[PDB]
Coordinates of N, CA and C in Angstrom, one line a residue:
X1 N 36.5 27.3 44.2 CA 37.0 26.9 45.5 C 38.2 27.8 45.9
X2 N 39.4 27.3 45.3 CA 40.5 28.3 45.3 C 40.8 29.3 44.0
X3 N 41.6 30.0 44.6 CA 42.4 30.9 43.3 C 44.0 30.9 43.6
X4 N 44.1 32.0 42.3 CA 45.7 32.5 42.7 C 45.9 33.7 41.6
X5 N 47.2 34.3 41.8 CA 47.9 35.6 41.0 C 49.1 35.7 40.9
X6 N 49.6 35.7 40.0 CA 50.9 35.8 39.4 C 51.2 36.8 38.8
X7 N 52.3 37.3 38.9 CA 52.9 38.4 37.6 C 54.4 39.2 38.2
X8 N 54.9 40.2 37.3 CA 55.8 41.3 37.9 C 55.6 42.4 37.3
X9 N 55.3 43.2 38.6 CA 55.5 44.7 38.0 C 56.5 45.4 38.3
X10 N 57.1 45.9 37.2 CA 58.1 46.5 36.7 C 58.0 46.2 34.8
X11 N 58.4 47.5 34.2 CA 58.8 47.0 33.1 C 60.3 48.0 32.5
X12 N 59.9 49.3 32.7 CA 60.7 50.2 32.9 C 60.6 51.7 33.7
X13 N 61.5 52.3 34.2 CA 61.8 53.4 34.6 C 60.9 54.6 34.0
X14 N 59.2 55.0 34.0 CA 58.9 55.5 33.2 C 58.7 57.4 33.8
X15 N 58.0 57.2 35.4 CA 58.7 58.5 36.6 C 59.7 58.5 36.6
X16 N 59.7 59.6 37.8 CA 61.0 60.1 38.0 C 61.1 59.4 39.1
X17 N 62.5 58.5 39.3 CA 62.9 57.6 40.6 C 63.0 58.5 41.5
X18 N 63.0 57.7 42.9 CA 63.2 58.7 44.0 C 63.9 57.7 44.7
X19 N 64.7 58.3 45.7 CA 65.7 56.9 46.3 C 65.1 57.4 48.5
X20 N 63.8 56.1 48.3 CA 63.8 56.0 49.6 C 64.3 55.1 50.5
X21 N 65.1 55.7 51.8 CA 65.2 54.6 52.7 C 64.1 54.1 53.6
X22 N 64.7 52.7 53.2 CA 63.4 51.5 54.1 C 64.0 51.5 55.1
X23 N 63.3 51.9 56.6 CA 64.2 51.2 57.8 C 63.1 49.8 58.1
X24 N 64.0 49.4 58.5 CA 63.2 47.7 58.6 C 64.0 47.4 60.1
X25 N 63.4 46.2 60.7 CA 63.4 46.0 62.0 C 64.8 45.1 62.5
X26 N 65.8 45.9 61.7 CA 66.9 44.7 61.8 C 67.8 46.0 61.4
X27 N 68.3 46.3 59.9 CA 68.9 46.5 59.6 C 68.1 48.0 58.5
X28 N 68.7 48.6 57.5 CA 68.3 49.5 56.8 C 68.5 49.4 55.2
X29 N 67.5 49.8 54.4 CA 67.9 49.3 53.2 C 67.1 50.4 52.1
X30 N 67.7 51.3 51.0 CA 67.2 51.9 49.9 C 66.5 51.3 48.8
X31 N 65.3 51.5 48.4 CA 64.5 51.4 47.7 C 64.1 52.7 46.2
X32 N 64.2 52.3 45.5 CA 64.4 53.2 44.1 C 63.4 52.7 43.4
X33 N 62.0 53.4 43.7 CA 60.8 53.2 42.8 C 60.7 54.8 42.5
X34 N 59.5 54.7 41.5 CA 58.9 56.2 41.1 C 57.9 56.7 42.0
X35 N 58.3 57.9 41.6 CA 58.0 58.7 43.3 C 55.9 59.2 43.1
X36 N 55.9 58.9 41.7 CA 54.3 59.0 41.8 C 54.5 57.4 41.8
X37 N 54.3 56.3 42.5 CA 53.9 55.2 42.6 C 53.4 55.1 43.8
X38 N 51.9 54.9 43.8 CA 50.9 54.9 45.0 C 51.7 54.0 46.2
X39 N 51.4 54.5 47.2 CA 51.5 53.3 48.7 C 51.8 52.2 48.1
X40 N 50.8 51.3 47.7 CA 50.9 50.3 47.3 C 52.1 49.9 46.6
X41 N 52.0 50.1 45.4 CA 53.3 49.9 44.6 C 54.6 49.4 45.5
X42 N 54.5 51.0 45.6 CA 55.9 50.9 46.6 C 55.8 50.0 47.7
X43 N 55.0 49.3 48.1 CA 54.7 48.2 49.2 C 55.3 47.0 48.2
X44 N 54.7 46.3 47.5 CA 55.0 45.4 46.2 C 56.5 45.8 46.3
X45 N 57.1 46.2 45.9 CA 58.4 46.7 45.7 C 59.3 45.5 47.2
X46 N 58.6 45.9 48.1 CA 59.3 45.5 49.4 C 58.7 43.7 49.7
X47 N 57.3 43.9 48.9 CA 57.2 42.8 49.0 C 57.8 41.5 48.3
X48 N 58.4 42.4 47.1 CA 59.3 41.9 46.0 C 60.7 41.0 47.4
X49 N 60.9 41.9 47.4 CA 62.7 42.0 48.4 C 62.3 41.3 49.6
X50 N 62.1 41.7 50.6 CA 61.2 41.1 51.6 C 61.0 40.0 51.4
X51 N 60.2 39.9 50.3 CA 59.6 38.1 50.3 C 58.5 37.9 51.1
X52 N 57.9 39.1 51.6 CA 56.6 38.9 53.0 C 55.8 39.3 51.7
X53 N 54.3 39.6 52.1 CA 52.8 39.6 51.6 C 52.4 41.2 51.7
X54 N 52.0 41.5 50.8 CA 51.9 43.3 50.2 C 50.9 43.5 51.5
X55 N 50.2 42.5 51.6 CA 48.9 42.4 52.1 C 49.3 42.7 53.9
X56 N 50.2 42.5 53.8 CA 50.6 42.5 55.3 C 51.6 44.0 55.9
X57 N 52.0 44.3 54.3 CA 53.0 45.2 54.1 C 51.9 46.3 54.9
X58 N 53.0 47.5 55.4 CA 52.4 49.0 55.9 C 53.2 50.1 56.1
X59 N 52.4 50.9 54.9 CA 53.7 52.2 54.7 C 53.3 53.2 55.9
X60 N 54.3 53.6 56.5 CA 54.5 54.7 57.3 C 56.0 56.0 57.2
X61 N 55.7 56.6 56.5 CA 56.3 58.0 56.4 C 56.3 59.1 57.3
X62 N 57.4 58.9 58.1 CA 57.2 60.3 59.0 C 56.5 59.6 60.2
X63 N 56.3 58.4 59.9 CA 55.4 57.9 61.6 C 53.6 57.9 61.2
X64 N 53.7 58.4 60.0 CA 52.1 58.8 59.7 C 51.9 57.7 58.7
X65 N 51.1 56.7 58.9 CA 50.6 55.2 57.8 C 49.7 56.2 57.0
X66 N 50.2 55.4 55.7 CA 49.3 55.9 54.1 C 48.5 54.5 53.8
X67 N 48.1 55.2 53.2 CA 47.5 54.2 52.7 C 47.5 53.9 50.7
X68 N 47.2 52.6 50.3 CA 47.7 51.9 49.4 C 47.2 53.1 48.0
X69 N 46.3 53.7 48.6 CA 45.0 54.8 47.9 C 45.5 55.9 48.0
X70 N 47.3 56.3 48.3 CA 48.0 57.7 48.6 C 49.6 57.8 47.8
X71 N 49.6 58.5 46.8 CA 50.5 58.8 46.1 C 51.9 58.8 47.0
X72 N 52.9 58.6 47.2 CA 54.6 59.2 47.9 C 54.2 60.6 47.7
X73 N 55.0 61.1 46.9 CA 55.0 62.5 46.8 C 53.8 63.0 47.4
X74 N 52.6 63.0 46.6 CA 51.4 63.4 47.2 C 51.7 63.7 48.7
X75 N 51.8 62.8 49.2 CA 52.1 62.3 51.1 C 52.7 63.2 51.5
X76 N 53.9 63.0 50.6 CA 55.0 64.1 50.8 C 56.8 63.3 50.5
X77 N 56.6 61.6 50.5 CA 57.4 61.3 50.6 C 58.2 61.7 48.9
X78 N 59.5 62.4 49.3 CA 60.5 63.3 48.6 C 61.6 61.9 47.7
X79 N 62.7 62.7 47.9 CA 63.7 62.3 47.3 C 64.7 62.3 48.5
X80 N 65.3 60.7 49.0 CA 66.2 60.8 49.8 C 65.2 60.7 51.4
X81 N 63.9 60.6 51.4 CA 62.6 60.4 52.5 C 63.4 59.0 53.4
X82 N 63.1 58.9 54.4 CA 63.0 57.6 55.2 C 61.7 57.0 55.4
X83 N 61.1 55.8 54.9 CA 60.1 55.2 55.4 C 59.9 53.9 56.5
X84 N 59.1 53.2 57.4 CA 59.8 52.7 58.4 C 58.3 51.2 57.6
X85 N 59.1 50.1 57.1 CA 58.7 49.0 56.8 C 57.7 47.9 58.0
X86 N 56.9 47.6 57.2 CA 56.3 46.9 58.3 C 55.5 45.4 58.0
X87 N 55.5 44.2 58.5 CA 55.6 42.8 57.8 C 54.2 42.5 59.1
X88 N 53.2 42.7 59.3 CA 52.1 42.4 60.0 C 52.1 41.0 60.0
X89 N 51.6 40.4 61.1 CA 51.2 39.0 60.8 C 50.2 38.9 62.1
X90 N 49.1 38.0 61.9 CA 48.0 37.8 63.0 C 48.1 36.1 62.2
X91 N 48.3 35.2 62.8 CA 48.4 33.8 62.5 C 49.5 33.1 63.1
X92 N 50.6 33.4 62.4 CA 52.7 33.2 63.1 C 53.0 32.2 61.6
X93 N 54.3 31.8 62.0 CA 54.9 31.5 60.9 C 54.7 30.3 59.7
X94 N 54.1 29.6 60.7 CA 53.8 28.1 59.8 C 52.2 28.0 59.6
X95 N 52.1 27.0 58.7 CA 50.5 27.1 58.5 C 50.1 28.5 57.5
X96 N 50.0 28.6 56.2 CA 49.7 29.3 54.9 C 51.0 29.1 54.0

């Protein structure tokens, strides 16, 4: 009927960090994951902090959205990059 998923990823520093800033819709905030960590990851990361749903999460670098299936670096996102955070919702706050 139902499910669920638990865990954390992180265990250690095993890339090379890259220190991206998150701009988020408020204020601004650095993020220090490894720079080969897919879209994804790096979403998780925010979704860590955040506290919102990876699932909702959406990386855009440069204005251009990657997707969860696109390396940083690959993309292009560097060292010292700005990415602009994104917390989607089609529902609203109450109710899940």
């Amino acid at each position: 009927g139902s499910s669920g998923s638990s865990g954390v990823s992180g265990r250690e520093p095993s890339s090379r960090i890259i220190r991206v800033s998150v701009k988020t819709p408020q204020d601004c905030h650095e993020f220090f994951l490894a720079e080969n960590s897919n879209v994804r990851r790096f979403k998780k990361q925010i979704s860590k902090y955040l506290h919102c749903n990876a699932d909702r999460l959406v990386l855009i670098f440069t204005g251009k959205i990657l997707r969860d299936q696109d390396i940083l670096s690959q993309r292009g996102i560097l060292d010292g990059s700005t990415v602009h955070v994104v917390v989607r919702s089609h529902s609203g706050p109450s109710s899940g």
